[PDB]
Design a protein around this ligand. Structure first.
Ligand SMILES: [Zn+2]
Ligand SMILES: [Zn+2]
Ligand SMILES: [Zn+2]
Lengths: 134, 54, 176, 309, 39, 37, 167, 85, 157, 66
RNA sequence: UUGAAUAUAAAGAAUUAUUAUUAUAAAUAUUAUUUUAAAAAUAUAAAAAUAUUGUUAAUAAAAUUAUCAAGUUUCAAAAGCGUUUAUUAAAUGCGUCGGUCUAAGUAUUAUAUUUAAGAUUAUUCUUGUAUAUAGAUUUUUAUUUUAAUUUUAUUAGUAGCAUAGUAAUUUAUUAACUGAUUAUUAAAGCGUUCCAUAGAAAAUUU
RNA sequence: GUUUAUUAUUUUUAGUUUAAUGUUUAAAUAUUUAACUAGUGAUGGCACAGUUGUUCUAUAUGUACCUAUAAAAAAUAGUA
């Protein structure tokens, strides 16, 4: 990851935070507040993709279903997430990796590397399963 | 098995999903070579516990 | 070349120099005789060799006794990397009476990481024979089944297993 | 004890000065007296190993290395003994690198800190107390008023109350000279140059210490020359003529007429006195040739100081 | 490790040897980093 | 025998050309604080 | 006047004054000038005269706990040549009881000092006081089961075994 | 030429079993079980070296003194036989 | 020497040191290579210092690890950086009281420093000195020339 | 330790030009602690300091984190 | 894991190459990359009678060995043991000595040098640099620097000694352009000389 | 590892003063080997940079020819 801050990336941030060349800024007090819209669009309308891998939760019973969570979801948030959104109430230990997003060459030829994610092997108490009738 | 510096052959590493063959991970073709990091830690690394002084 | 201050413990073998001297191993057993034989060689390690200069002043005498080791709690409190203004001893303590505890310097923790990886190595060998004391131990136990089942079979089929001749060449107990 | 200083002589040439009474190394390194520092080698501002620019007195001798060893014995020294509070010589410590002897004095109001050890001092005796006389006892630190003509004093302080600077080296002694000045006393420093020391200055009575250093200390062992470690002092006549004017020559070239270190050090030329103090009376050049005794005869006044230098 | 190339002038006259003293051409387009400061 | 021909020496010669942010931080009037006037 | 009079010390190790200073003076008979020279000791001390086995009434000198008979190399068996006194054979120590008893760290360079049936570190047992080493504190560098002690002591011809040439 | 936990034996080793040379596993007769033997010393060779007599390396001065105790002074028992049958 | 075995290299290799990073920090800043404006000198380390060194001016035992051997003895005494000036506040010792305060407060802080020096020379050279040692030089016969010690002996006492 | 804007906590993920030389030496070099174990970066895939979850609190000795 | 966070197999010589990357830790895994029917050279040498240097610029410091891998002795020349890009009377280094320095470091000290330790001694004489100097130059020699052309006394001397030469004598060898000895005017060694001298390089004997 | 009364000192000494092989070689220095080997004073924290650093001094080296690299020129080359 390139640490060096680019000029444009701040300008592209403002124009969507508040209409930058046209609408004057919100006073710095509001920007330091949990009522600033991107801190308000977050505290009430989260944007997360906790996708579940099924290859470990399929017909084979499992006590350790595996997820993928965005790289910036820490453990105790994955608890809060499954607890308050998917009613999951039995999580004693979570086990978290970080994986370089999948890479490949498209038929054209550019290396189209997907975004990176974060395997988080949660460990439920009573095992869970999924049925697949053929 | 343990978290040691080692030399692996490249075919052993398993290839990406090829047109001829699915993604053959290094594990599902060599199960008994998956490192067991419980067995590593239990044996080779020093636990916070054993030196906790305060 | 990987300055020694980087290694957790300074390296065991210490390579030098000397275009006209070719030997890997540092000559120990000479660095040992000096030091054991001559008291002065190694700096006094202040405390165990202070505590005089503090007995002489307060008692009017030479201490004339073995100085306690393990510097008293409260000595060398501003020092940070003592390790020389001491023996390799730890920074003694606070000025407290709590039970002695090793201040877990990065060094002490490494020694813990050895005495666990020493017990690790001596354990991977101690039982590589314990099972080698089954494989060959049980291979023999089984091999003698073979020479028994061969021993039983070689009597009914009468193959004396002693050449083309009859035992009359054996009974002579010559070569023949 | 025979001869409180010995030329111990481990090898027939290697003669180091052991003194019976010398404290064993264990009773040497004292915590609140031990200083450690890296000494800059000869590197001065911009690394750049180099001496001093011609006019200055801050020494970075080009040929210097390993000045502070790191686990060498390094206790700090007092140099300011107090006037007439009794001492008590607890031990006599001998550091090789700082060739000085120095013994720990209790000093009778607890101060286990005093070092400079005058010649013929014994341990476990009280020193700073005067006998019936004015203050004529070996080790007694005497103001220059209290000395009489012709008796040695060491660790004389140059400016009164500013610590002893003159005659600190082993066996050295500044001899009084009986001057005529109103409130000043001239001392024949060992450099054969006389100096109008203020009479209120403090000096320690006696010789300095450790006689038999002037000679009789000869290492001649590769390990033992680490009492004085210094850089190699190369020939100036094998120095890559591009570098040093004395150089090359297909054989042993004797050397150039005017010797020079890098700038100039011609043999008796470079005399580098640039500022003479108001106290200075006759520099070492004005006396270098007379004798030790003839300089002890005259009386010294302001008219003896030569108006031109 | 570094070098100013100018050589440290006396502490009293801080600047001897400007690069102009040598009839130097230092256009920004010629050698790049040129344009002097005393200007 | 140099070292580190690998990829980190292949990025650190390409990503560091990225021009950092510039903010003309003008000099702070330490000794003459203007707001205490 | 062969000129290069300062030289390389080219011919050491090729001398007869050398051949006598290279020998080892071990516990054998091997009159002299017959012991091994370069490694200083012969490999495989044959000991057919006395079998040199680990005893049954064996115990740690430092710790005193009984020692596994022979199935293991957990014990550091120092047979000090012919010892007899420490045990039927020489001192015995589990690898972890091989520390100095008084100072409790390792026995540096492995020379120990049997103080009243508890191996003491030579430096402490000698009165010196520098009491912590650098490398490994509480475990010595020693070899196990005499494998480090077979550089010395009792090679094959211990005593006058002239039974060999006599009738 | 090989000993034991407490005993001895003797055997000439080939090239094929050079692996088992240092420490073998064998039936220790001063016991009734297989027990690990060692290699207390050499007792010759398994074949000839080129251009050399039958005893090219020679057993030892040592393994001979082991032999001179086994066969050696049998004077306790020339009775019950000497070499005959 | 004609054989460079080149195996005595390769042991304990050096860190990678990624010198492009310092090469970048130059450009990502106005400065060139820090031309001999500094060029450098070897900075001190924390180990070679000796805190509790009875020098150090007793205010600086952490800031003095930095600073040269030639400059740390002279580093000046300043303050704990939280010690406030002596403040002419009104808090009088709990039991010193008035009459004493009314008298003492009359004396100013050179009228009291002066009294203190006389008393201290009087406390020393009193029970303290007359009890054992002597602190005033004696004459021919051995009579104490000056009444009380000289102002220097007291200063260093 | 990246940190949330609102959180008063201070983390060492700086991006000032004076601080990136060390923030890369954490991501590519990693730290070799003097205790023998390699810290923050010990293997192959170098971390992404800007996709870390935010620093939640300073560590304590008794528990892990206050 | 019960730590939040964080990340765990793979190098460098251009290569999958000479190549144990020795930070550590011990010590019996029956761990697993090497074509093939010949004699020349050559790399190389198991084996084997005599002879022992007659080979050669010159034998002898010249791999391993279970037959267990080691030449002895005398003389002459030659210091320190460290350290060097064509590896040594190279350059270091202790002492002595010369000079400098009492407002940054202790004038039996530290700068700045010349030598070399140890043991004997350390000679004759000065035209210039330096010092001192007096408006400066020009003049000017207590010590120091450099010098001595017949300095040349001590001392060794055909010697790493400008030719003359294989020096003339003596030995030594069957044969002495070797080497050592005596003395001794050595093209112009020379007092820092000379002796003493150990593993080196020579010369013998063996 | 070791000789010696000796903490000094002989010296086990598998990476290095020699020799063979190699000679676009497995190597823009490797294989075998002689020698040497005792470093409480040193492969090594960071520090000095190009009319210059460093130099136990060899005009040696300061990134695999020190003539530093890198960069910028139209130097001169008709005077076989
Ligand atoms: Zn035990
Ligand atoms: Zn102990
Ligand atoms: Zn048995």
């Amino acid at each position: 990851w390139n640490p060096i801050a680019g000029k444009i990336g701040l300008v592209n941030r403002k124009a969507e935070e508040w209409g930058w060349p046209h609408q004057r800024p919100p006073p710095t007090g509001l920007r330091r507040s949990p009522e600033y819209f991107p801190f308000f669009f977050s505290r009430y309308f989260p944007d997360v993709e906790v996708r579940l891998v099924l290859d470990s939760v399929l017909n084979n019973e499992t006590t350790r279903p595996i997820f993928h969570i965005p790289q910036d979801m820490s453990k105790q948030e994955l608890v809060n997430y499954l607890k308050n959104i998917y009613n999951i109430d039995n999580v004693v230990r979570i086990r978290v990796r970080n994986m370089r997003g999948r890479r490949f060459k498209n038929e054209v030829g550019e290396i189209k590397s997907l975004p990176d994610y974060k395997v988080a092997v949660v460990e439920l108490d009573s095992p869970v399963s999924i049925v697949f009738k053929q | 098995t343990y978290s040691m510096k080692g030399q692996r052959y490249p075919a052993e590493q398993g290839r990406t999903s090829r047109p001829g063959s699915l993604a053959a991970s290094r594990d599902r073709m060599f199960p008994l070579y998956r490192r067991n990091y419980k067995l590593n830690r239990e044996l080779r690394v020093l636990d916070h516990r054993r030196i906790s002084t305060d | 070349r990987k300055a020694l201050q980087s290694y957790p413990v300074p390296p065991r073998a210490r390579n030098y120099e000397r275009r006209w001297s070719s030997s890997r191993t540092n000559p120990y057993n000479r660095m040992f005789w000096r030091t054991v034989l001559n008291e002065d060689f190694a700096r006094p390690s202040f405390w165990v060799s202070d505590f005089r200069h503090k007995y002489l002043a307060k008692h009017g005498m030479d201490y004339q006794g073995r100085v306690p080791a393990s510097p008293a709690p409260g000595m060398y409190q501003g020092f940070s990397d003592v390790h020389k203004i001491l023996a390799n001893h730890p920074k003694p303590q606070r000025e407290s009476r709590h039970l002695p505890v090793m201040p877990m310097t990065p060094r002490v923790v490494f020694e813990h990481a050895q005495e666990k990886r020493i017990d690790y190595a001596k354990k991977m060998h101690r039982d590589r024979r314990l099972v080698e004391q089954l494989r060959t131990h049980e291979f023999w136990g089984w091999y003698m089944k073979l020479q028994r089942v061969r021993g039983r079979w070689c009597k009914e089929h009468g193959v004396s297993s002693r050449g083309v001749y009859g035992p009359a060449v054996d009974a002579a107990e010559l070569w023949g | 004890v025979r001869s409180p200083d010995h030329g111990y002589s481990q090898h027939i040439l290697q003669k180091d000065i052991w003194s019976p009474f010398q404290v064993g190394a264990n009773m040497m390194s004292y915590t609140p007296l031990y200083y450690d520092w890296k000494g800059f080698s000869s590197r001065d501002y911009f690394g750049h190993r180099s001496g001093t620019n011609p006019g200055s007195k801050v020494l970075l001798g080009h040929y210097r290395r390993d000045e502070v060893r790191s686990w060498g014995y390094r206790i700090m020294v007092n140099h300011k003994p107090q006037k007439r509070i009794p001492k008590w010589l607890a031990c006599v410590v001998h550091i090789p690198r700082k060739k000085t002897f120095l013994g720990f004095f209790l000093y009778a109001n607890g101060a286990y800190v005093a070092e400079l050890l005058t010649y013929k001092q014994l341990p476990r005796i009280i020193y700073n107390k005067a006998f019936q006389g004015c203050l004529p006892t070996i080790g007694q630190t005497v103001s220059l008023t209290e000395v009489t003509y012709g008796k040695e004093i060491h660790s004389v302080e140059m400016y009164p109350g500013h610590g002893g600077v003159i005659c600190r080296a082993s066996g050295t002694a500044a001899v009084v000279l009986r001057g005529s000045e109103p409130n000043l006393v001239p001392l024949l420093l060992p450099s054969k140059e006389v100096r109008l020391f203020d009479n209120m200055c403090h000096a320690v009575f006696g010789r300095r210490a450790g006689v038999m250093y002037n000679k009789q200390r000869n290492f001649s062992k590769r390990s033992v020359e680490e009492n004085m470690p210094h850089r190699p002092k190369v020939h100036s006549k094998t120095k890559r003529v591009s570098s040093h004017p004395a150089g090359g020559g297909n054989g042993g070239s004797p050397n150039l007429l005017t010797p020079l270190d890098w700038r100039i050090h011609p043999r008796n030329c470079v005399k580098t006195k640039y500022w003479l103090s108001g106290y200075i009376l006759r520099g070492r050049q004005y006396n270098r040739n007379q004798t030790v005794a003839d300089l002890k005869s005259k009386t010294y006044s302001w008219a003896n100081r030569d108006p031109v230098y | 490790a570094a070098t100013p190339g100018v050589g440290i002038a006396p502490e009293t006259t801080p600047v001897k040897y400007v690069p102009e003293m040598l009839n130097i051409q230092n256009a920004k387009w010629w050698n790049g980093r040129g344009k002097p400061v005393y200007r | 025998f140099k070292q580190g021909q690998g990829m980190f020496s292949h990025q650190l010669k390409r990503i560091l050309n990225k021009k950092s942010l510039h903010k003309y931080n003008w000099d702070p009037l330490h000794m003459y604080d203007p707001r205490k006037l | 006047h062969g000129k290069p009079a300062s030289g390389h010390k080219v011919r050491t190790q090729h001398s007869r004054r050398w051949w006598m200073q290279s020998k080892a003076h071990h516990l054998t008979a091997v009159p002299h000038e017959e012991a091994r020279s370069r490694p200083h000791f012969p490999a495989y001390t044959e000991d057919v005269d006395q079998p040199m086995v680990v005893p049954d009434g064996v115990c740690c000198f430092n710790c005193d706990k009984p020692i596994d008979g022979d199935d293991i190399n957990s014990y550091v068996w120092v047979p000090s040549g012919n010892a007899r006194v420490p045990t039927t054979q020489g001192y015995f120590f589990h690898v972890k009881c091989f520390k100095c008893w008084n100072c409790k760290y390792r026995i540096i360079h492995n020379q120990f000092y049997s103080k009243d049936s508890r191996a003491w570190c030579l430096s402490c047992a000698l009165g010196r006081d520098i009491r912590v080493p650098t490398r490994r504190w509480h475990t010595s560098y020693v070899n196990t089961h005499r494998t480090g002690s077979r550089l010395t002591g009792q090679f094959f011809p211990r005593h006058r075994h002239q039974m060999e040439f006599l009738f | 030429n090989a000993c034991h936990v407490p005993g001895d034996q003797i055997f000439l080793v080939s090239n094929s079993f050079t692996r088992r040379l240092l420490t073998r596993t064998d039936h220790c007769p001063k016991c009734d079980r297989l027990s690990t033997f060692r290699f207390m010393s050499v007792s010759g060779m398994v074949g000839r070296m080129p251009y050399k007599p039958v005893d090219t390396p020679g057993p030892s001065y040592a393994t001979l003194y082991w032999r001179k105790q086994r066969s050696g002074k049998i004077a306790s028992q020339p009775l019950n036989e000497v070499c005959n049958k | 020497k004609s054989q460079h075995k080149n195996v005595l290299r390769k042991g304990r290799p050096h860190m990678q040191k990624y010198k492009e990073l310092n090469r970048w920090q130059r450009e990502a800043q106005g400065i060139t290579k820090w031309e001999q404006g500094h060029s450098h000198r070897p900075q001190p380390y924390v180990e070679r210092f000796n805190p509790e060194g009875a020098g150090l001016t007793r205010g600086t035992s952490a800031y003095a690890w930095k600073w040269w051997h030639t400059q740390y003895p002279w580093l000046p005494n300043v303050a704990p950086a939280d010690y406030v000036p002596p403040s002419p506040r009104g808090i009088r010792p709990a039991a010193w009281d008035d009459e004493f305060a009314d008298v003492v407060l009359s004396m100013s802080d050179e009228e009291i420093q002066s009294y203190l020096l006389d008393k201290l020379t009087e406390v020393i050279f009193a029970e303290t000195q007359r009890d054992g040692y002597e602190l005033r030089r004696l004459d021919f016969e051995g009579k104490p020339l000056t009444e009380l010690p000289e102002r220097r002996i007291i200063e260093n006492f | 330790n990246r940190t949330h804007p609102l959180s008063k906590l201070r983390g060492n993920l700086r991006r000032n030009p004076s601080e990136i030389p060390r923030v890369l030496n954490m991501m590519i070099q990693g730290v070799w602690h003097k205790s023998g174990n390699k810290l923050y970066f010990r293997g192959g895939k170098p971390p992404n300091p800007s996709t870390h979850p935010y620093l939640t609190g300073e560590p304590c000795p008794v528990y892990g984190w206050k």
